Design an enzyme around this catalytic site. Structure first.
Site, PDB file in Angstrom:
ATOM      1  N   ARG A   1       0.836  -1.200   0.000  1.00 43.97           N
ATOM      2  CA  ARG A   1       0.000   0.000   0.000  1.00 43.97           C
ATOM      3  C   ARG A   1       0.875   1.256   0.000  1.00 43.97           C
ATOM      4  NH1 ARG A   1      -5.247  -1.571   0.135  1.00 43.97           N
ATOM      5  NH2 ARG A   1      -5.824  -3.415   1.387  1.00 43.97           N
TER       6      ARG A   1
ATOM      7  N   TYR B   1       1.919  -1.364 -10.664  1.00 42.97           N
ATOM      8  CA  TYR B   1       0.804  -2.137 -10.116  1.00 42.97           C
ATOM      9  C   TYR B   1      -0.509  -1.371 -10.003  1.00 42.97           C
ATOM     10  CZ  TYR B   1      -1.737  -5.523  -7.260  1.00 42.97           C
ATOM     11  OH  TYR B   1      -2.659  -6.442  -6.794  1.00 42.97           O
TER      12      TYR B   1
ATOM     13  N   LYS C   1      -8.173   5.007 -10.365  1.00 44.29           N
ATOM     14  CA  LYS C   1      -8.446   5.904  -9.238  1.00 44.29           C
ATOM     15  C   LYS C   1      -7.949   7.319  -9.512  1.00 44.29           C
ATOM     16  CE  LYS C   1     -10.161   2.867  -6.393  1.00 44.29           C
ATOM     17  NZ  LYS C   1     -11.631   2.845  -6.183  1.00 44.29           N
TER      18      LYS C   1
ATOM     19  N   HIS D   1     -17.003   7.338  -5.361  1.00 46.88           N
ATOM     20  CA  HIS D   1     -16.660   5.934  -5.144  1.00 46.88           C
ATOM     21  C   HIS D   1     -17.940   5.124  -4.902  1.00 46.88           C
ATOM     22  CE1 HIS D   1     -13.856   3.015  -2.701  1.00 46.88           C
ATOM     23  NE2 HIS D   1     -14.011   2.625  -3.953  1.00 46.88           N
TER      24      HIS D   1
ATOM     25  N   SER E   1     -13.653   0.175   0.559  1.00 48.03           N
ATOM     26  CA  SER E   1     -13.129  -1.125   0.160  1.00 48.03           C
ATOM     27  C   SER E   1     -13.291  -2.138   1.301  1.00 48.03           C
ATOM     28  CB  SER E   1     -11.644  -0.974  -0.228  1.00 48.03           C
ATOM     29  OG  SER E   1     -11.016  -2.230  -0.420  1.00 48.03           O
TER      30      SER E   1
ATOM     31  N   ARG F   1      -5.815  -9.768  -8.068  1.00 48.89           N
ATOM     32  CA  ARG F   1      -6.847  -9.151  -8.879  1.00 48.89           C
ATOM     33  C   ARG F   1      -7.127  -9.909 -10.161  1.00 48.89           C
ATOM     34  NH1 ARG F   1      -7.035  -4.013  -6.018  1.00 48.89           N
ATOM     35  NH2 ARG F   1      -9.060  -3.663  -7.036  1.00 48.89           N
TER      36      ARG F   1
HETATM   37  N1  LIG Z   1     -21.814 -10.156   6.890  1.00 41.40           N
HETATM   38  C1  LIG Z   1     -21.824  -9.595   5.652  1.00 41.40           C
HETATM   39  N2  LIG Z   1     -20.661  -9.572   4.968  1.00 41.40           N
HETATM   40  C2  LIG Z   1     -20.584  -9.032   3.730  1.00 41.40           C
HETATM   41  C3  LIG Z   1     -21.792  -8.472   3.120  1.00 41.40           C
HETATM   42  N3  LIG Z   1     -21.438  -8.005   1.906  1.00 41.40           N
HETATM   43  C4  LIG Z   1     -20.101  -8.247   1.757  1.00 41.40           C
HETATM   44  N4  LIG Z   1     -19.596  -8.862   2.844  1.00 41.40           N
HETATM   45  C5  LIG Z   1     -18.197  -9.293   3.077  1.00 41.40           C
HETATM   46  O1  LIG Z   1     -17.316  -8.168   3.037  1.00 41.40           O
HETATM   47  C6  LIG Z   1     -16.087  -8.523   2.390  1.00 41.40           C
HETATM   48  C7  LIG Z   1     -15.871  -7.563   1.234  1.00 41.40           C
HETATM   49  O2  LIG Z   1     -16.983  -7.672   0.340  1.00 41.40           O
HETATM   50  P1  LIG Z   1     -16.849  -7.041  -1.131  1.00 41.40           P
HETATM   51  O3  LIG Z   1     -18.184  -7.189  -1.822  1.00 41.40           O
HETATM   52  O4  LIG Z   1     -15.725  -7.682  -1.914  1.00 41.40           O
HETATM   53  O5  LIG Z   1     -16.459  -5.537  -0.718  1.00 41.40           O
HETATM   54  P2  LIG Z   1     -15.783  -4.438  -1.677  1.00 41.40           P
HETATM   55  O6  LIG Z   1     -14.281  -4.468  -1.503  1.00 41.40           O
HETATM   56  O7  LIG Z   1     -16.275  -3.093  -1.176  1.00 41.40           O
HETATM   57  O8  LIG Z   1     -16.169  -4.609  -3.126  1.00 41.40           O
HETATM   58  C8  LIG Z   1     -16.233  -9.942   1.872  1.00 41.40           C
HETATM   59  O9  LIG Z   1     -15.491 -10.824   2.723  1.00 41.40           O
HETATM   60  C9  LIG Z   1     -17.720 -10.238   1.978  1.00 41.40           C
HETATM   61  O10 LIG Z   1     -17.935 -11.609   2.326  1.00 41.40           O
HETATM   62  C10 LIG Z   1     -23.026  -8.542   3.916  1.00 41.40           C
HETATM   63  O11 LIG Z   1     -24.093  -8.083   3.447  1.00 41.40           O
HETATM   64  N5  LIG Z   1     -22.976  -9.102   5.140  1.00 41.40           N
HETATM   65 ZN   LIG Z   2     -12.561   1.046  -4.872  1.00 43.84          ZN
END
Ligand SMILES: Nc1nc2c(ncn2[C@@H]2O[C@H](COP(=O)(O)OP(=O)(O)O)[C@@H](O)[C@H]2O)c(=O)[nH]1
Ligand SMILES: [Zn+2]
Ligand SMILES: [Mn+2]
Length: 595
Positions: free
Chosen positions: A70, A209, A218, A238, A260, A378
């Site tokens: 990071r 990267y 971004k 975002h 994120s 990714r």
């Molecule tokens: N408990 C719970 N966990 C969630 C939910 N939505 C996402 N997660 C968890 O949060 C983490 C990140 O989710 P993601 O959709 O990839 O988040 P992003 O990085 O913002 O796109 C993952 O481990 C998911 O399993 C939810 O509605 N409930």
């Molecule tokens: Zn993002």
């Protein structure tokens, strides 16, 4: 060179004289060019070609392990005045920065090809297409830019002879001397990702990267774009863009900002659990929102591809993501390689006993102590291969937004869903978005981080002025036309540490309440922090969950909220002198209702 844009040509000359590459190449974005770049990437060892039978035209790239770190402290907003970067941003005097980076850039592309990559953010058919040209010495960047943006000939023609465009300079910062053997993934120990907002320029150096090197992801889409939107009267955010379709076949569009790791991808790929409801996506990361003739706010995804997180992704967790990948044309970075030439990552189904990990080393089941895939590895894949992509994804007019949602991870305090009292209150709840996350190089366990509109590391100008900007757009709009603002929390936990709400697909029940509120057909209690539904205002038909848990998820406890107030206050003090009175007024109002 296939253009007569003299401003463009002069810039390429000036840059080439500094970096001294072996040659310069304009990219056109064609499929034969793509296949040509990939072939060269395979030859260099940067790509390995994946077994065609499982993946059409797909590649694995393994980075230098020091280039996945990071780099927030190396990311800079170099406005003329420090106050215009503000307390959420790293500032350095623009003259000082240039002198640092010019020293770095001089001769940096020695022994390398210098690519000139024209591209369009958003659909080509737009009236003011936001154009950019990225110069880079990284072929990997060219290939990934092709997927992540509308790259090449079309954008170059849209530039005309004197059309404006964002100047994006990138170098991996590893000059080769005449004898020298290259490496698969060149980069430098010295890294800068710098933004000059007044001129709309991005200078990146030293990393090849992701968001450091793919300058649309971004750097353009949020940092430079938020500055543009600031000056031009719109919003660069975002946010995912979700199309929710009712049993009666009416479409509702929502934009939702989560930091994120807080659920943007999952909500974007929502598979509703209530019969007759469907969902499609227009994007899961960036939304550009502009007022239309309608007086309504219209969202467009300025990107052309998905740069998703691989680990955790599987046919159960996200079948739509898997189908998108299955169609091929994907570049995986830092995942593992199976014995049959497939890719694998933690969480993916299958039980491989041996793998080649993301550093090229042998990995063994129940033995090797390190992840097989980098934990933030990714995939980079075309949006158009997504089976639930909404048909209006490439529509330059965008989609009318009915609701804006803010949310993060809160184990306590914040209810499952709240509706704002009005636009200004909405700005306040966005502005004070909290999330229980931290990172290495930060530490701070148990901390509630304030991540305003999920933009903490992405604002291209002062956070206070940004809040004022949000305030102004609503102040000057037709109140009835503005999206309603909602605050959500999927992550509230009970005394035993269980999630009170199951989430994922069941979040469609929350969105249904939101739609019902839009349609004026759902109740909700006035609480100190906003309108919050009672459990009977939600559609829990078919859901095997304890009613008492849903009531707890929705609870607004005046004590928890009083303990929340000094956290908000010290955040609002950190915002500093540009903290708008509108946000101050909302904090006072909240305090008064809590008593
Ligand atoms: N408990 C719970 N966990 C969630 C939910 N939505 C996402 N997660 C968890 O949060 C983490 C990140 O989710 P993601 O959709 O990839 O988040 P992003 O990085 O913002 O796109 C993952 O481990 C998911 O399993 C939810 O509605 N409930
Ligand atoms: Zn993002
Ligand atoms: Mn995501």
């Amino acid at each position: 060179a296939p253009t007569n844009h003299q401003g463009l040509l002069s810039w390429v000359e000036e840059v080439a004289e500094l970096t001294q590459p072996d040659r310069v190449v304009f990219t056109d974005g064609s499929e034969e060019e793509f296949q040509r770049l990939c072939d060269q990437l395979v030859e260099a060892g940067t790509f390995i070609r994946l077994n065609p039978e499982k993946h059409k035209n797909s590649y694995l790239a393994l980075s230098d392990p020091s280039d996945v770190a990071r780099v927030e402290s190396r990311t800079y907003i170099c406005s003329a005045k420090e106050i215009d970067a503000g307390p959420t941003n790293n500032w350095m005097d623009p003259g000082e920065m240039r002198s640092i980076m010019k020293d770095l850039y001089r001769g940096c592309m020695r022994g390398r090809t210098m690519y000139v990559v024209p591209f369009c953010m958003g659909p080509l058919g737009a009236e003011d297409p936001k154009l950019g040209v990225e110069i880079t010495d990284s072929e990997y960047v060219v290939v990934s830019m092709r997927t992540m943006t509308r790259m090449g000939k079309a954008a170059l023609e849209k530039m005309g002879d004197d059309g404006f465009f964002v100047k994006a300079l990138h170098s991996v910062g590893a000059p080769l001397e005449p004898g020298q053997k290259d490496v698969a993934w060149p980069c430098s120990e010295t890294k800068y990702i710098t933004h000059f907002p007044e001129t709309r320029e991005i200078w990146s150096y030293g990393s090849g990267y992701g968001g450091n090197a793919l300058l649309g992801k971004k750097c353009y889409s949020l940092r430079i774009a938020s500055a543009m939107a600031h000056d031009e009267g719109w919003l660069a955010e975002h946010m995912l863009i979700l199309k929710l379709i009712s049993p009666e076949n009416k479409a509702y569009y929502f934009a939702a900002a989560f930091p994120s790791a807080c659920g943007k991808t999952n909500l974007a790929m929502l598979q509703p659990t209530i019969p007759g409801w469907r969902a499609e996506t227009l994007g899961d990361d960036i939304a550009w929102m502009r007022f239309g003739k309608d007086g309504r706010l219209y969202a467009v995804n300025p990107e052309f591809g998905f740069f998703g997180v691989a680990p955790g992704t599987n046919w159960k967790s996200n079948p739509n993501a898997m189908r998108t990948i299955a169609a091929g044309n994907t570049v995986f970075t830092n995942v593992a390689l199976t014995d049959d030439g497939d890719v694998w990552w933690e969480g993916l189904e299958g039980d491989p006993q041996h793998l080649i990990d993301w550093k090229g080393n042998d990995w063994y089941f129940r033995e090797t102590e390190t992840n097989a895939a980098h934990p933030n590895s990714r995939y980079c894949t075309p949006m158009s291969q997504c089976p639930i992509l909404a048909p209006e994804w490439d529509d330059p007019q965008g989609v009318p937004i009915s609701g804006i949602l803010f949310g993060g991870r809160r184990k306590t305090t914040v209810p499952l869903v709240t509706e704002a009292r009005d636009w200004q209150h909405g700005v306040f709840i966005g502005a004070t978005l909290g999330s229980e996350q931290t990172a290495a190089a930060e530490g701070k366990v148990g901390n509630v981080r304030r991540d305003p509109m999920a933009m903490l590391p992405f604002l291209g100008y002062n956070v206070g002025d940004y809040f004022q900007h949000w305030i102004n757009l609503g102040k000057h709009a037709d109140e009835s036309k503005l999206p309603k603002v909602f605050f959500v929390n999927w992550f509230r936990r009970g005394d035993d540490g269980r999630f009170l709400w199951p989430g994922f697909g069941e979040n469609s029940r929350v969105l249904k309440w939101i739609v019902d509120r839009i349609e004026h057909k759902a109740g909700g209690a006035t609480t100190p922090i906003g309108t919050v539904p009672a459990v009977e205002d939600l559609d829990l038909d078919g859901l095997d969950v304890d009613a008492a848990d849903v009531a707890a998820a929705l609870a607004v406890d005046a004590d928890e909220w009083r303990q929340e107030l000094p956290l908000i206050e010290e955040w609002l003090q950190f915002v500093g002198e540009k903290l708008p009175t509108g946000v101050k007024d909302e904090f006072d109002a909240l305090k008064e209702r809590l008593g």
